[PDB]
Amino acid sequence: MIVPVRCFSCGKVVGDKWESYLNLLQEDELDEGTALSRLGLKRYCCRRMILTHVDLIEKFLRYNPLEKR
Amino acid sequence: SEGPQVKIREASKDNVDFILSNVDLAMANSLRRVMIAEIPTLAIDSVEVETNTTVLADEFIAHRLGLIPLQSMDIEQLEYSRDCFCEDHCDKCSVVLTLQAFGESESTTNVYSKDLVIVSNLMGRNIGHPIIQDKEGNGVLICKLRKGQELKLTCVAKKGIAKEHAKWGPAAAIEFEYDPWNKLKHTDYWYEQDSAKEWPQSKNCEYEDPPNEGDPFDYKAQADTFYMNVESVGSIPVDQVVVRGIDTLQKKVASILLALTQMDQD
Amino acid sequence: LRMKHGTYDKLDDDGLIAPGVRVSGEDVIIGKTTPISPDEEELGQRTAYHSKRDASTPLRSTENGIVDQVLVTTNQDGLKFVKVRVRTTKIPQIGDKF
Amino acid sequence: MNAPDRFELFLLGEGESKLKIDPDTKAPNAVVITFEKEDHTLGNLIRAELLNDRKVLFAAYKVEHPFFARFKLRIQTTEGYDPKDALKNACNSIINKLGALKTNFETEWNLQTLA
Amino acid sequence: TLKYICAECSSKLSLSRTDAVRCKDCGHRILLKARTKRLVQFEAR
Ligand SMILES: [Zn+2]
Ligand SMILES: [Zn+2]
Ligand SMILES: [Zn+2]
């Protein structure tokens, strides 16, 4: 629902590359493969972590908080 | 010196690509396994949640926090919590971080690992700082807050090895190759029409002479000249992964020697 | 009377456990009592002080986890009723089906 | 629920020793050594180093079950050569080779200036 | 006596035994028990 911290297979930290992955797609107009290779994800185990991730936390954040401070 | 030889092909902040020569297969594989699973590292082990109004579960957040790479350069100065005489944790065996995030903005506030604040006394060591790698300066995206949501928690990070849990592993993926030309015939190459055409040559084939395709099979040849590429998660520098792996394997063998002498004296 | 052997200490004054509290197997999460006829003779441990019996709701004997959300409301009849959500991890282990 | 603690992969328990050497009655001058809280990482290294010893007739290791972090190492040496001394020599040669490897890697890393 | 939060208006209320379970601000009859004030410990594995 949010980007995993580490790649499942090898353990490379991919959780810090998610926000820069979206920038490479929306304002640099790169295709997904070049955006993955630019971030340093050269193993397809790491590439499937970012490429196949679904950001379901954005849908969860549209609901109003139950306990609002 | 006489023994295993190292020729480093490439060196980076988080990658070292080297040729480990004049060494047996078992010791190269043992070094690979020790770097993967046996190097002590600092990682967040226990999370005490005070406030959690996020959309993520407490245990979800705790599992994400365990996988945050923390600085572990001076991890040998830290003690295992099982070997410490304190009740739960202290500065001698743990590093206490805190994380206080509030959604004060109308847009979504991202909670990063740069927001983790060490509140324990480090005693001048070089541990506990979350590792920052990207150019933006933020860390790993821990959570996301909408307006009015709060996340207050306290992490205790203790030293451990990747055999206990993979959050303590600093070794990422370790590339490990030998005999790229298959001159030892350790693989029987599957093929449809031609094995040489259908199997792409590895990048290490430039570092060995190709076979002369008329010479007899060398039955006396053993596996040496390993091409290894260690990648660092960031917790320790990539050279310290290899050095600490050699040290850990040496300490394991020395512990076997010590136990052997202790039961020899009885 | 007839109290369950599980702990009741995690309950609050309303008989409901607060969200966030960790629960373990056969622990009471909803506490409920019903009145009985006074001055009976059953099971030996029956006295005039025992004006009620326990109709509490324990957790499953093998399950555990964290109380995620406790919801108090009324039904169509106006009777008060509660819903307690317990949240746990299912980490894959030997025998899990994929 | 039935999952064992992970520290049982590398922590010696109560009343458990690191090594446990038994004589082997199948062959003369042969012992079986049970290594607790170790795995293929130590076993393969020790076995392949023992096979480089010239006076060792047999060296093998097995992990009887992957659930338990322990392995059995059978050593059979020549007559007049204690298999405990063969284990000591194999361990010492591994220590020396690893020390040489550490020094070589440190010097070669210090030669690198692009890090 | 015990703290609750209304499900839709998210207003903190204090309810006793005799109080009917109903929000005093927006009248929604669904109330959530407040999260506990004691700190709860999670292993980060
Ligand atoms: Zn990966
Ligand atoms: Zn301590
Ligand atoms: Zn309301």
Q: DSSP for B17-82?
A: EEEEES--HHHHHHHHHHHHHT--EEEEEEEEEEEE-SSS-HHHHHHHHHTS-EEETTTTTS--GG
Helix, coil or strand: residue B94: strand
Helix, coil or strand: residue C65: strand
Cβ of residue A68 closer than 8 Å to a chain E Cβ? yes
Chains D and A touching, counted as 3 or more CB pairs less than 8 Å apart: no
CATH code, domain with D79: 3.30.1360.10
Q: Give the pair of three-digit tokens for residue D70.
A: 């322990």
Nearest to B77 by CA among B130, B127, B129: B127
Helix, coil or strand: residue E12: strand
Q: Residues of E within the annotated binding site?
A: 6, 9, 23, 26
**Count of domains for chain D:** 1
Resolution (A): 3.1
Could you count the other beta carbons within 10 Å of the beta carbon of residue B158? 21
Full residue range of the structural domain in which residue A57 is found: 1-69
Helix, coil or strand: residue B120: coil
Residue E36 DSSP class: P
Max Cα–Cα distance, chain B, nearest Å = 76
C-alpha–C-alpha distance, residues C35 and C38, integer Å: 9
The ligand that comes nearest to the alpha carbon of residue B82 is 2
Q: Give the pair of three-digit tokens for residue C53.
A: 């019996």
- Is B33 exposed, middle or buried, given 0-12, 13-18 or 19+ CB atoms closer than 10 A? buried
The dihedral through the CA atoms of D18, D21, D22, D24 has a sign that is positive
Substitution target in B38, B253, B255 with the highest count of D β-carbons within 10 Å is B253
Distance B4 CA to ligand 1 centre (A): 29
Distance D13 CA to ligand 2 centre (A): 21
The ligand that comes nearest to the alpha carbon of residue E26 is 3
Full residue range of the structural domain in which residue D43 is found: 6-111
C-alpha–C-alpha distance, residues E4 and E14, integer Å: 6
CB pair distance less than 8 Å for B26 and D6: no
Q: In this complex, which of B134, B148, B169 lies closest to A16 when CB atoms are compared? A: B134
In chain C, what residues touch B49 (CB-CB under 8 Å)? 20
C-alpha–C-alpha distance, residues B173 and B159, integer Å: 21
**Is D36 inside a domain boundary?**
yes
**Is D105 inside a domain boundary?**
yes
* Residue pairs spanning C and E at CB distance below 8 A: 49
Numbers of helices and strands, H then E, in chain B: 4, 12
Residue in C closest to E5 by C-alpha: C71
**Count of domains for chain A:** 1
**Is D1 inside a domain boundary?**
no
C-alpha–C-alpha distance, residues C5 and C59, integer Å: 12
Residue with tokens 């002080």: C49
Instruction: Estimate the share of chain A in helix, then strand, then coil, as percent rounded to the nearest 5.
Output: 40, 5, 55
* Residue pairs spanning A and B at CB distance below 8 A: 84
Structural biology method used: cryo-EM
In chain B, what residues touch E43 (CB-CB under 8 Å)? 45-47, 62
